[PDB]
Design a protein around this ligand. Sequence first.
Ligand SMILES: Nc1ccc(-n2ccc(=O)c3c(N)ncnc32)cc1
Length: 303
Amino acid sequence: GTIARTIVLQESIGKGRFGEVWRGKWRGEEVAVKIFSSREERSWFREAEIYQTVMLRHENILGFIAADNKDNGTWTQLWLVSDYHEHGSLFDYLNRYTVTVEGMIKLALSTASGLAHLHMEIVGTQGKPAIAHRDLKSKNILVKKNGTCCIADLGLAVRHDSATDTIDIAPNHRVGTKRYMAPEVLDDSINMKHFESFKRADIYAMGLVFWEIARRCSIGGIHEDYQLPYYDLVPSDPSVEEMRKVVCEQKLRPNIPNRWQSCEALRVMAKIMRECWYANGAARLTALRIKKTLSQLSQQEGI
Ligand SMILES: Nc1ccc(-n2ccc(=O)c3c(N)ncnc32)cc1
């Protein structure tokens, strides 16, 4: 179509299970283009559908430009064009850098604000349904030039129909990254007909991401090396059984260093983490409550 024909792909930057991400140039501006083959039309269409949800746009959700198709003369490529963020993922950013207390709060508050918007139902003619991500992780959050985050990779999301309390694609199977699966998803006790259960599972994953950020917060030159949650308990690319044994059976969570109690911002972050990690999803904080707590902390810090 008219957009793809004017885009020049400059570099393949990431390959995943669902499409390949390229850096391209559109109207002289850098854009990200996720490309799918003809046999991945269902994943491409579903991701285009989620990104076109009414009132979805928000500073902390990846800005979607358009879906399109490009025929090179041999085969067709299915495209999803979005904003490009040079820093890449929060995982890449946290591996490359340490952050200040201000930096950590900006990353955590922006992630929570994005998740609170995703989770929020807006009633009305131009209403927005509540959406649960189902695959939140540091590799799926991007970092903008201004040091704030935006949630991306919304292709596995589910949307709620509040009038009937049903889910648009009626999920019947586990999806997502095993390391970040909530206890109820690992032991298959989650009620997949209950939309609020998917929101609660996203909060557990956000707690893990907050732990990744807090390790990189450098105060007086003191910080931890970058690690994925559960690096100390499971192998790389862990199985559901490996994760379940640790999270559900042994009931372990990522370690919270004692020294995080010595700094008010780290104390607030550690308390949020614990309150995201409860085995009972109904006891977890909501994204809106986390946004409120961190906004109160950001104001206090003078960010
Ligand atoms: N290493 C790495 C990290 C992140 C990405 N990546 C993935 C999906 C995106 O949508 C995206 C984007 N919009 N802007 C910049 N990077 C993006 C690719 C490679």
